[PDB]
C-alpha cells in the first residue's frame, strides 16, 4: 500500500468536486489540503498512536470553509465565523483484527449515510426532535 | 417529520445488518441502541449545544462492541469482550447556511468513503504513509 | 522520496511473509507494525540521534511475537504468548563517508548470514561451542 | 562439531573479504578477530546467558575499524582512526522451539536485507524520512 | 507527488554539481545532505509551523562547508575548515492564495538573480553602495 | 562598481514586472522599494557588518504584499493579513575568498530554483511530504 494520496473530499457529482491533496507529513501527521488560501481551504489531518497499553487511537481532524458569501482569496474576519471544525477520536482496542476494524469503518459510514438522522440534522441546522 | 428514527448503523447487505433504534432522550442526549442486552448493545448518542455565542457544537458518540459470553461464578452471562469508541465533536458557526452545512456533511461522508486513505488505514491496522 | 515505507520483515518465500507497515513517526522514532491485531503484531522501531559531538547513534528495535489465543472465563482474545526482543545500537563517527557506512552495513549482513556461527547458534537454541 | 570457527564478516565478492577468526573464549565470551594488526582488526564477540527464569539473552558485539596510519615524531604506527560499534541484545523465552528461533533469525536478516529502510538509511548517513 | 526529493544545490554546469538528498524527517524538520561524511556535508533543513493564529512560518537553513583534511593526533580526518550559514524565516499570512505565494517565490529568485545588487555584493566581499 | 541600482524583483516576463528602486541609504542600510504606497510596496533592505571576530553577516529583508483582492491605493487592515516577511541572515567566515562567496551565492540560487522542493512547497501553501 501507500495510502497517502489525493482524494475527493466533497463529491458534487464530477463537476465542482473538492479534491484534497497531501500537503504535509511532519511528525507522521498526514495532512491534506485543497487548492485555496489556508484561510479558505478544506483541510484534513490524520495520525495514530497507541494511547494506552490496551488501545490505539486515530485522531482525525477536518476543517470546512463557510462558502456562502465568501470573498474568494480575500480576508474574511473573524476567522471563526468562517470555518467549521470536526474532531474525531477513534479508540480501538489492540485485540481488534482487520475484520473488526472493517466493521468499525462500516459503522462510521452507516452513521453518516444520507437520509440517516445525524447527517440530516446537521444539514438542516437542527438537533434531534 | 421527526428525525429521531431508527437507522442501520452497519450495512452488511441485508443479512446481519446492525440496526439501531431510538431509546432515550433524557437530558437532551438523543440515544439509539441495537436490539441487544444493554451489556452487548451498539450505542449511538448525539447532542447539540450552543457552545459559544457564535458557535453550535454537535457531540456524537458511537460504541461498537465485540460480543462474548463470559462465565462468572460458574454462570454464563452475555457480555462485551471490549468496545471501540468513536468520539466526534463538530463546531459550526451560526452564520453557516443550510447549503454551508450540506458541505460539511458531504465532506464527512467523502472522508470515510470506501477506498479513500483514512478508512483504508483504519481497516488495515495501519497508519498513513 | 521516502524510506519510511512498508517492507518484508520475514521472507517465507512469497507466502506467509511478514510485512511490516509504517504506523507512527512521533518524536523522531519511526515505527512499523504488521497487520491484524496490534496484540499479535511484529514491531520495528528506529531512531537516529547525535550521541556525542563526533558520533551519531542508531537505535533499532524488533519484537517477534508468538501468536496465541488466550481464553479466560470463556472469552477468547488474540494475544502474544510471549515476545522475543531484539535491541541494537549502532554508533558511527561523523567522519564516516558513505563508503564506510556501506561497509558497516555489509558487516551486519555478514554477521547474520545463513550458515555463519551466530545465526546458526540462535536458530538452534544454542551458544558457541 | 563446532560453530566457534572462522567466517566471512564482510563479503566483497571473493577479493578483499574480511574474514574473522576465533581468538579467545574466556568466561563464556566467544571472540573473533580479523588478521594482521590487532590495532586495525575487526572484532566480534558473542555470549549467551540465562537473563531470567524464562529468558535467555544473547549479547553480540561488532567493531568495524577505519584503517589508518598514525605518525607521531616520525614514527609510523598502524592504528584505527576510529571505530563504529554495533551492540545487540536478543532476548528469547525458554518456550521458543527451534522453529520459533529460525523465525527470529529470519526477522533479523530481513531487517537488514539490502534495499529495506533501515540498512539503506545507515548506508547513506541518513535517518528515516 | 511527494516534494521531498533530491535537488542540485550548486549548479556548476554538470561537472562538480553539489546535489543534496533527503536524509531525515525526524521531529518535523525535513533534512537534505550531500553525499559526504557528516563532517563535510552540505546541509539543508526546512520546517513549517503555524506561528500565530493567522501566520505560517517557514524556517530554512543551509550550511556550505569549506572542506579540508586535518591531522589530529597524527591521523588524517575528513573535516570542515569552516562553514557558512544561511538562515531564513518566511512569515506568510493564511489569507495568501497560491498566486500570492508564487509572487513571494518569484521575488526571492529575482532578489538573487546573477547581476542583481545583492548577489553581486556578496560575491565580491562588498557592501551595497 | 556601485551596486545600488534599480532591479527587477519579480520577473513576470517583461509585462507586469515588479521593478524595485533605491529609496533610502540611512545608516548604510540600502533600501529598495516599488512604486506603491508603503503599505502595498515590495520592499528590500540589505546591510553587512562584522558580527564576530571570525564572521561577517549580511542581513537581507524582503516584504511582499498580498495582492489577491487588494484595494489598490486603499487602506487594507490589519496590515499583517496583507504582507509576507522574509528574513535572511547570511554568516560568512572572514576566510571566505571571492570564489567561496560565488559558491555561497550559487547554493542560494539553487535552493530556490523553480521545480526544487523548497520553492514548490511555498508556492503550493505546503510543507514537505
Short mmCIF file of N, CA and C in Angstrom, two decimals, chain D:
data_model
loop_
_atom_site.label_atom_id
_atom_site.label_comp_id
_atom_site.label_asym_id
_atom_site.label_seq_id
_atom_site.Cartn_x
_atom_site.Cartn_y
_atom_site.Cartn_z
N UNK D 1 32.05 -31.51 16.11
CA UNK D 1 31.21 -30.35 15.71
C UNK D 1 31.74 -29.09 16.38
N UNK D 2 31.52 -27.94 15.75
CA UNK D 2 31.97 -26.68 16.30
C UNK D 2 31.44 -25.52 15.48
N UNK D 3 30.94 -24.49 16.15
CA UNK D 3 30.47 -23.31 15.45
C UNK D 3 31.39 -22.15 15.81
N UNK D 4 32.41 -22.44 16.62
CA UNK D 4 33.40 -21.45 17.01
C UNK D 4 34.48 -21.52 15.93
N UNK D 5 34.15 -21.07 14.73
CA UNK D 5 35.09 -21.10 13.63
C UNK D 5 35.19 -19.80 12.88
N UNK D 6 36.09 -19.80 11.92
CA UNK D 6 36.36 -18.68 11.06
C UNK D 6 35.17 -18.46 10.13
N UNK D 7 34.86 -17.21 9.84
CA UNK D 7 33.76 -16.91 8.93
C UNK D 7 33.97 -15.56 8.28
N UNK D 8 33.28 -15.35 7.17
CA UNK D 8 33.39 -14.10 6.43
C UNK D 8 32.44 -13.07 7.00
N UNK D 9 33.00 -12.01 7.56
CA UNK D 9 32.20 -10.94 8.14
C UNK D 9 31.75 -9.98 7.05
N UNK D 10 32.62 -9.70 6.08
CA UNK D 10 32.28 -8.77 5.00
C UNK D 10 32.55 -9.41 3.64
N UNK D 11 31.47 -9.66 2.88
CA UNK D 11 31.54 -10.26 1.54
C UNK D 11 31.81 -9.18 0.50
N UNK D 12 33.03 -9.16 -0.02
CA UNK D 12 33.38 -8.20 -1.05
C UNK D 12 33.58 -8.96 -2.36
N UNK D 13 32.72 -9.96 -2.55
CA UNK D 13 32.76 -10.77 -3.75
C UNK D 13 33.98 -11.66 -3.97
N UNK D 14 34.55 -12.19 -2.89
CA UNK D 14 35.71 -13.06 -3.03
C UNK D 14 37.08 -12.43 -2.84
N UNK D 15 37.22 -11.15 -3.16
CA UNK D 15 38.50 -10.47 -3.02
C UNK D 15 38.40 -9.26 -2.09
N UNK D 16 39.12 -9.31 -0.98
CA UNK D 16 39.06 -8.21 -0.02
C UNK D 16 37.96 -8.48 0.99
N UNK D 17 37.64 -9.75 1.17
CA UNK D 17 36.63 -10.18 2.12
C UNK D 17 37.26 -10.04 3.48
N UNK D 18 36.48 -9.62 4.47
CA UNK D 18 37.02 -9.52 5.80
C UNK D 18 36.62 -10.80 6.50
N UNK D 19 37.62 -11.61 6.82
CA UNK D 19 37.42 -12.87 7.49
C UNK D 19 37.79 -12.64 8.94
N UNK D 20 37.01 -13.23 9.82
CA UNK D 20 37.21 -13.08 11.24
C UNK D 20 37.48 -14.49 11.81
N UNK D 21 38.51 -14.64 12.65
CA UNK D 21 38.87 -15.95 13.21
C UNK D 21 38.83 -16.02 14.73
N UNK D 22 38.51 -17.21 15.27
CA UNK D 22 38.43 -17.43 16.72
C UNK D 22 39.70 -16.97 17.40
N UNK D 23 39.58 -16.25 18.51
CA UNK D 23 40.77 -15.80 19.18
C UNK D 23 40.80 -16.14 20.65
N UNK D 24 39.64 -16.13 21.29
CA UNK D 24 39.61 -16.39 22.71
C UNK D 24 38.18 -16.73 23.10
N UNK D 25 38.00 -17.60 24.09
CA UNK D 25 36.66 -17.99 24.55
C UNK D 25 36.68 -18.03 26.06
N UNK D 26 37.20 -16.99 26.69
CA UNK D 26 37.27 -16.94 28.14
C UNK D 26 36.00 -16.38 28.76
N UNK D 27 35.60 -16.97 29.89
CA UNK D 27 34.42 -16.56 30.64
C UNK D 27 33.09 -16.53 29.88
N UNK D 28 32.88 -17.49 28.99
CA UNK D 28 31.64 -17.53 28.24
C UNK D 28 31.49 -16.51 27.14
N UNK D 29 32.56 -15.79 26.81
CA UNK D 29 32.51 -14.79 25.74
C UNK D 29 33.38 -15.23 24.57
N UNK D 30 32.74 -15.62 23.47
CA UNK D 30 33.46 -16.06 22.29
C UNK D 30 33.89 -14.82 21.56
N UNK D 31 35.16 -14.77 21.16
CA UNK D 31 35.69 -13.63 20.45
C UNK D 31 36.36 -14.04 19.15
N UNK D 32 36.11 -13.28 18.10
CA UNK D 32 36.71 -13.50 16.78
C UNK D 32 37.43 -12.20 16.42
N UNK D 33 38.58 -12.29 15.78
CA UNK D 33 39.37 -11.12 15.40
C UNK D 33 39.91 -11.35 14.00
N UNK D 34 39.95 -10.32 13.17
CA UNK D 34 40.48 -10.47 11.82
C UNK D 34 42.01 -10.48 11.91
N UNK D 35 42.66 -10.89 10.84
CA UNK D 35 44.11 -10.99 10.85
C UNK D 35 44.85 -9.64 10.80
N UNK D 36 46.17 -9.72 10.90
CA UNK D 36 47.05 -8.57 10.92
C UNK D 36 46.95 -7.80 12.23
N UNK D 37 47.50 -6.60 12.28
CA UNK D 37 47.50 -5.80 13.50
C UNK D 37 46.20 -5.80 14.26
N UNK D 38 46.28 -6.19 15.53
CA UNK D 38 45.12 -6.21 16.40
C UNK D 38 44.56 -4.79 16.48
N UNK D 39 45.43 -3.80 16.31
CA UNK D 39 45.01 -2.40 16.38
C UNK D 39 44.09 -1.99 15.24
N UNK D 40 44.15 -2.71 14.13
CA UNK D 40 43.31 -2.40 12.97
C UNK D 40 42.32 -3.51 12.67
N UNK D 41 42.16 -4.44 13.60
CA UNK D 41 41.30 -5.58 13.38
C UNK D 41 39.82 -5.38 13.64
N UNK D 42 39.01 -6.16 12.93
CA UNK D 42 37.58 -6.15 13.14
C UNK D 42 37.42 -7.06 14.34
N UNK D 43 36.35 -6.90 15.09
CA UNK D 43 36.15 -7.72 16.27
C UNK D 43 34.68 -8.09 16.43
N UNK D 44 34.42 -9.34 16.80
CA UNK D 44 33.06 -9.82 17.01
C UNK D 44 33.07 -10.64 18.29
N UNK D 45 32.09 -10.44 19.16
CA UNK D 45 32.01 -11.23 20.38
C UNK D 45 30.58 -11.68 20.53
N UNK D 46 30.38 -12.78 21.24
CA UNK D 46 29.05 -13.31 21.45
C UNK D 46 29.01 -14.08 22.75
N UNK D 47 27.93 -13.92 23.51
CA UNK D 47 27.78 -14.64 24.75
C UNK D 47 26.29 -14.83 24.97
N UNK D 48 25.94 -15.96 25.56
CA UNK D 48 24.55 -16.27 25.85
C UNK D 48 24.49 -16.51 27.32
N UNK D 49 23.39 -16.13 27.94
CA UNK D 49 23.26 -16.32 29.36
C UNK D 49 21.79 -16.28 29.73
N UNK D 50 21.42 -17.02 30.78
CA UNK D 50 20.03 -17.06 31.24
C UNK D 50 19.81 -15.76 32.00
N UNK D 51 19.11 -14.80 31.38
CA UNK D 51 18.88 -13.49 31.99
C UNK D 51 17.84 -13.53 33.11
N UNK D 52 16.85 -14.40 32.97
CA UNK D 52 15.81 -14.54 33.97
C UNK D 52 15.39 -16.01 33.94
N UNK D 53 14.42 -16.37 34.77
CA UNK D 53 13.96 -17.75 34.83
C UNK D 53 13.37 -18.21 33.51
N UNK D 54 12.82 -17.28 32.74
CA UNK D 54 12.18 -17.63 31.48
C UNK D 54 12.86 -17.14 30.22
N UNK D 55 13.94 -16.37 30.36
CA UNK D 55 14.60 -15.84 29.18
C UNK D 55 16.07 -16.11 29.09
N UNK D 56 16.53 -16.30 27.86
CA UNK D 56 17.94 -16.48 27.60
C UNK D 56 18.25 -15.21 26.81
N UNK D 57 19.45 -14.68 26.97
CA UNK D 57 19.81 -13.45 26.31
C UNK D 57 21.16 -13.53 25.62
N UNK D 58 21.18 -13.19 24.34
CA UNK D 58 22.40 -13.18 23.56
C UNK D 58 22.92 -11.75 23.53
N UNK D 59 24.23 -11.59 23.65
CA UNK D 59 24.84 -10.27 23.58
C UNK D 59 25.91 -10.39 22.50
N UNK D 60 25.65 -9.77 21.36
CA UNK D 60 26.57 -9.80 20.22
C UNK D 60 27.18 -8.41 20.07
N UNK D 61 28.46 -8.32 19.73
CA UNK D 61 29.11 -7.03 19.54
C UNK D 61 30.04 -7.07 18.36
N UNK D 62 30.04 -6.03 17.55
CA UNK D 62 30.90 -5.96 16.38
C UNK D 62 31.60 -4.61 16.35
N UNK D 63 32.86 -4.59 15.92
CA UNK D 63 33.63 -3.36 15.81
C UNK D 63 34.17 -3.29 14.39
N UNK D 64 33.87 -2.20 13.69
CA UNK D 64 34.35 -2.01 12.33
C UNK D 64 35.31 -0.84 12.39
N UNK D 65 36.59 -1.08 12.10
CA UNK D 65 37.59 -0.02 12.15
C UNK D 65 37.78 0.74 10.86
N UNK D 66 38.31 1.95 10.98
CA UNK D 66 38.64 2.76 9.83
C UNK D 66 40.17 2.73 9.90
N UNK D 67 40.76 1.91 9.05
CA UNK D 67 42.20 1.72 8.98
C UNK D 67 42.95 3.01 8.65
N UNK D 68 44.05 3.24 9.35
CA UNK D 68 44.86 4.44 9.13
C UNK D 68 46.24 4.29 9.71
N UNK D 69 47.13 5.20 9.35
CA UNK D 69 48.49 5.19 9.85
C UNK D 69 48.69 6.43 10.70
N UNK D 70 49.14 6.23 11.93
CA UNK D 70 49.39 7.34 12.82
C UNK D 70 50.86 7.65 12.72
N UNK D 71 51.19 8.92 12.59
CA UNK D 71 52.58 9.32 12.50
C UNK D 71 52.85 10.37 13.56
N UNK D 72 53.61 9.99 14.58
CA UNK D 72 53.96 10.90 15.66
C UNK D 72 55.47 10.88 15.86
N UNK D 73 56.08 12.05 15.70
CA UNK D 73 57.51 12.16 15.86
C UNK D 73 58.30 11.36 14.85
N UNK D 74 57.74 11.15 13.66
CA UNK D 74 58.45 10.40 12.64
C UNK D 74 58.24 8.90 12.71
N UNK D 75 57.56 8.45 13.77
CA UNK D 75 57.28 7.03 13.97
C UNK D 75 55.89 6.70 13.45
N UNK D 76 55.80 5.75 12.53
CA UNK D 76 54.53 5.31 11.97
C UNK D 76 53.98 4.13 12.76
N UNK D 77 52.67 4.12 12.99
CA UNK D 77 52.03 3.01 13.69
C UNK D 77 50.70 2.73 13.01
N UNK D 78 50.38 1.45 12.79
CA UNK D 78 49.12 1.08 12.15
C UNK D 78 48.07 1.20 13.24
N UNK D 79 47.07 2.05 13.03
CA UNK D 79 46.03 2.22 14.03
C UNK D 79 44.68 2.26 13.34
N UNK D 80 43.64 2.48 14.13
CA UNK D 80 42.29 2.62 13.62
C UNK D 80 41.96 4.08 13.92
N UNK D 81 41.71 4.86 12.88
CA UNK D 81 41.39 6.28 13.04
C UNK D 81 40.19 6.43 13.97
N UNK D 82 39.26 5.48 13.88
CA UNK D 82 38.06 5.43 14.71
C UNK D 82 37.38 4.09 14.45
N UNK D 83 36.35 3.78 15.24
CA UNK D 83 35.62 2.53 15.10
C UNK D 83 34.12 2.74 15.25
N UNK D 84 33.32 1.97 14.50
CA UNK D 84 31.86 2.01 14.63
C UNK D 84 31.60 0.84 15.56
N UNK D 85 30.67 1.00 16.47
CA UNK D 85 30.37 -0.05 17.42
C UNK D 85 28.94 -0.54 17.30
N UNK D 86 28.77 -1.81 16.97
CA UNK D 86 27.45 -2.41 16.90
C UNK D 86 27.30 -3.22 18.16
N UNK D 87 26.21 -3.02 18.87
CA UNK D 87 25.98 -3.75 20.09
C UNK D 87 24.52 -4.21 20.10
N UNK D 88 24.29 -5.52 20.06
CA UNK D 88 22.92 -6.02 20.06
C UNK D 88 22.60 -7.05 21.12
N UNK D 89 21.39 -6.97 21.65
CA UNK D 89 20.90 -7.87 22.69
C UNK D 89 19.62 -8.53 22.21
N UNK D 90 19.59 -9.85 22.25
CA UNK D 90 18.43 -10.61 21.80
C UNK D 90 17.90 -11.48 22.93
N UNK D 91 16.68 -11.22 23.38
CA UNK D 91 16.07 -11.99 24.46
C UNK D 91 15.10 -12.99 23.87
N UNK D 92 15.24 -14.26 24.24
CA UNK D 92 14.36 -15.31 23.74
C UNK D 92 13.87 -16.17 24.90
N UNK D 93 12.54 -16.25 25.09
CA UNK D 93 11.95 -17.05 26.17
C UNK D 93 12.27 -18.52 25.98
N UNK D 94 12.39 -19.25 27.08
CA UNK D 94 12.73 -20.67 27.03
C UNK D 94 11.65 -21.54 26.40
N UNK D 95 10.51 -20.95 26.06
CA UNK D 95 9.44 -21.71 25.43
C UNK D 95 9.62 -21.75 23.93
N UNK D 96 10.57 -20.96 23.43
CA UNK D 96 10.79 -20.90 22.00
C UNK D 96 11.37 -22.21 21.50
N UNK D 97 10.71 -22.79 20.51
CA UNK D 97 11.18 -24.02 19.90
C UNK D 97 12.21 -23.63 18.84
N UNK D 98 12.79 -24.62 18.18
CA UNK D 98 13.77 -24.33 17.14
C UNK D 98 13.12 -23.56 16.00
N UNK D 99 11.87 -23.89 15.69
CA UNK D 99 11.15 -23.22 14.62
C UNK D 99 10.95 -21.75 14.94
N UNK D 100 10.64 -21.45 16.20
CA UNK D 100 10.44 -20.07 16.63
C UNK D 100 11.76 -19.32 16.48
N UNK D 101 12.86 -19.97 16.84
CA UNK D 101 14.18 -19.34 16.74
C UNK D 101 14.57 -19.10 15.27
N UNK D 102 14.20 -20.00 14.36
CA UNK D 102 14.52 -19.80 12.94
C UNK D 102 13.78 -18.57 12.41
N UNK D 103 12.57 -18.35 12.92
CA UNK D 103 11.77 -17.22 12.51
C UNK D 103 12.44 -15.94 13.02
N UNK D 104 12.94 -15.99 14.25
CA UNK D 104 13.61 -14.84 14.85
C UNK D 104 14.81 -14.45 14.00
N UNK D 105 15.59 -15.45 13.59
CA UNK D 105 16.75 -15.20 12.76
C UNK D 105 16.33 -14.55 11.44
N UNK D 106 15.28 -15.08 10.81
CA UNK D 106 14.80 -14.53 9.55
C UNK D 106 14.37 -13.07 9.70
N UNK D 107 13.79 -12.72 10.84
CA UNK D 107 13.35 -11.35 11.06
C UNK D 107 14.57 -10.44 11.09
N UNK D 108 15.66 -10.91 11.69
CA UNK D 108 16.89 -10.11 11.76
C UNK D 108 17.51 -9.94 10.38
N UNK D 109 17.49 -11.00 9.58
CA UNK D 109 18.06 -10.96 8.24
C UNK D 109 17.23 -10.05 7.35
N UNK D 110 15.90 -10.14 7.48
CA UNK D 110 15.01 -9.32 6.69
C UNK D 110 15.17 -7.86 7.06
N UNK D 111 15.32 -7.58 8.35
CA UNK D 111 15.50 -6.22 8.81
C UNK D 111 16.67 -5.55 8.10
N UNK D 112 17.75 -6.29 7.93
CA UNK D 112 18.97 -5.77 7.32
C UNK D 112 19.15 -6.07 5.84
N UNK D 113 18.18 -6.72 5.22
CA UNK D 113 18.29 -7.04 3.81
C UNK D 113 18.48 -5.80 2.95
N UNK D 114 19.32 -5.94 1.94
CA UNK D 114 19.61 -4.85 1.01
C UNK D 114 18.33 -4.28 0.41
N UNK D 115 18.18 -2.96 0.46
CA UNK D 115 17.01 -2.33 -0.11
C UNK D 115 15.98 -1.89 0.90
N UNK D 116 15.92 -2.58 2.03
CA UNK D 116 14.95 -2.25 3.06
C UNK D 116 15.32 -0.93 3.73
N UNK D 117 14.34 -0.26 4.36
CA UNK D 117 14.52 1.02 5.04
C UNK D 117 15.74 1.22 5.92
N UNK D 118 15.88 0.39 6.95
CA UNK D 118 16.99 0.53 7.88
C UNK D 118 18.40 0.43 7.29
N UNK D 119 18.69 -0.66 6.55
CA UNK D 119 20.05 -0.71 6.00
C UNK D 119 20.34 0.41 5.02
N UNK D 120 19.35 0.85 4.26
CA UNK D 120 19.60 1.92 3.31
C UNK D 120 19.78 3.28 3.98
N UNK D 121 19.17 3.46 5.15
CA UNK D 121 19.33 4.71 5.88
C UNK D 121 20.76 4.78 6.40
N UNK D 122 21.21 3.71 7.06
CA UNK D 122 22.55 3.63 7.61
C UNK D 122 23.61 3.84 6.53
N UNK D 123 23.46 3.13 5.42
CA UNK D 123 24.40 3.20 4.31
C UNK D 123 24.49 4.58 3.69
N UNK D 124 23.52 5.44 3.97
CA UNK D 124 23.54 6.77 3.38
C UNK D 124 23.65 7.87 4.41
N UNK D 125 24.19 7.56 5.59
CA UNK D 125 24.34 8.56 6.64
C UNK D 125 23.00 9.24 6.85
N UNK D 126 21.92 8.48 6.86
CA UNK D 126 20.60 9.08 7.00
C UNK D 126 19.71 8.45 8.04
N UNK D 127 18.63 9.15 8.34
CA UNK D 127 17.64 8.65 9.27
C UNK D 127 16.45 8.25 8.44
N UNK D 128 15.27 8.20 9.05
CA UNK D 128 14.07 7.83 8.33
C UNK D 128 13.39 9.11 7.85
N UNK D 129 12.83 9.08 6.65
CA UNK D 129 12.15 10.23 6.08
C UNK D 129 11.03 9.78 5.16
#
